[PDB]
Every structure is written in C-alpha cells, then in structure tokens.
From a paper:
Here, we demonstrated that Sad1 in fission yeast directly interacts with histone H2A-H2B and H2A.Z-H2B heterodimers, but not H3-H4. Our results provide mechanistic insights into the spatial organization of heterochromatin mediated by the conserved SUN-family protein and reveal a previously-unrecognized nucleosome-independent function of free H2A-H2B.
We solved the crystal structure of the histone binding motif (HBM) of Sad1 in a complex with a H2A-H2B fusion protein and showed that the DEF/Y motif of Sad1 binds H2A-H2B. Only the Sad110-126–H2AB complex yielded high-quality crystals that diffracted to 2.15 Å resolution. Sad1112-123 adopts an extended conformation and primarily contacts H2B. The loop between α3 and αC of H2A also contributes to Sad1 binding, and this H2A region is conserved in H2A.Z, explaining why Sad1 does not bear a binding preference for H2A or H2A.Z. The binding between Sad1 and H2AB is mediated by electrostatic and hydrophobic interactions. The acidic Sad1 peptide sits on the highly basic surface of H2AB. A series of acidic residues in Sad1 (D114, E117, E121, and E122) are oriented toward H2AB and form salt bridges and hydrogen bonds with the positively charged residues in H2A and H2B. In addition to electrostatic contacts, the side chain of Sad1 F118 inserts into the shallow hydrophobic groove formed by the α1 helix, L12 loop, and α2 helix of H2B, and is embraced by Y42, I54, and M59 of H2B, which ensures the specific recognition of H2B by Sad1. The Sad1 F118A mutation destabilized the Sad1-H2AB complex, and the substitution of Sad1 F118 with a positively charged arginine residue (F118R) severely diminished the interaction between Sad1 and H2AB. We also created a combined 5 R mutation (F118R/D114R/E117R/E121R/E122R) of Sad1 and found that the mutation completely disrupted its binding with H2AB. Furthermore, superimposition of Sad1-H2AB with the nucleosome structure showed that the Sad1 peptide occupied the DNA binding site of H2A-H2B in the nucleosome, suggesting that Sad1 does not bind nucleosomal H2A-H2B.
Author numbering:
A (entry chain A): 37 to 154, 158 to 216
B (entry chain C): 112 to 123
Amino acid sequence: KETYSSYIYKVLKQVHPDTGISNQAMRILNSFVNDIFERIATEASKLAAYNKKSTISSREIQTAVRLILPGELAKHAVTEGTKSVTKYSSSAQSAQSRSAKAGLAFPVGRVHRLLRKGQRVGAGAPVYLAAVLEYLAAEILELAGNAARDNKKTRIIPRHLQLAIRNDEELNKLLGH
Amino acid sequence: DGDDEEFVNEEY
C-alpha cells in the first residue's frame, strides 16, 4: 500500500503538462500501480524459485511482465524496461540517483526495497520494474487525459479513468472488473 | 482531501 502519487504526478506533467488530476482519481491510479507491482513481483519471485535461481534478476522481471501484461502493453513495457536497464548500466560512473541513472521518475530504490521484503534482488531488477510501472502509469495517464480533453475538462476525474480503462481492450483486460 | 478536489503534490 505504498504511495506513488508524487511520481505519478511527475509523469502526468510530462504526458499532459496542462492537465490536472483529482484526489480520488490519483488514489485510483495509485491503487492500479500497487496492484500491478504485486502481480509482477510475485510472479517474478515464483519464476526465480521454480528455476532454482538465488537472485531475482531483470530476466525474471521481464518474463513476469509478459506473463502478467497483455500483448501490446507487454512489448512496450519490455521496451521501456530494457532501455532503462541499458541506460542504468552505462551510467555506473554517474554521481546521480538510481532513478536519474535509469532516466526514470519512479523511485528505483523503493522498488528494490519492496522487492526484497516480500530472496536476493539484482540491481537491474528494480530498474526494470520501476520502468514498467512508470510506463503503465504514463499509458493510463495519456489515455485518461485524452478523455478529459475530449470531454472539455482540464482535470482527470475518476470517470475519465473508467473511460480510458474500458475503451482500451488491453487495459480493460488488465484492470477492468 | 475532497474526492473532486485537485490533487496537490505535497513533494517538490
């Protein structure tokens, strides 16, 4: 039940710089992000155990992503995960934060911690997962903000979220019902 | 904290 709201907000100002979000709509997105983290992390830990791996690596996160997300969501999420890990590993001499080294707004360190308490976790695994969650947040925010703007509103409200989820076959499969 | 109220980012 972690709060990603500040990171969600930053993502919103990138995809829809001129669009607000209501309190309740933010709590709903936050609920979606928490739910998807749980699904992927649990899936990735099982894959590690079932393959006798000691470490949850980025390979397990990737396979779990494809197990949990429907087709086009998974491709794009894998693209974003792979790019973030490639940037991260090329930034090893950087003085910046882990999220900055990955080019991410979502908090890599917190994702690492949450992956550990719920055995070992490679340094690429939280970068990849943070990037997937950031992508899914951006995807939902892009569609929800399009719905608000088409509705002639400058703030995303829960109805805009519901429309965005329902009118997208993949998000409706992932997060509907 | 109202449902319809605009979210204010409490971090910077």
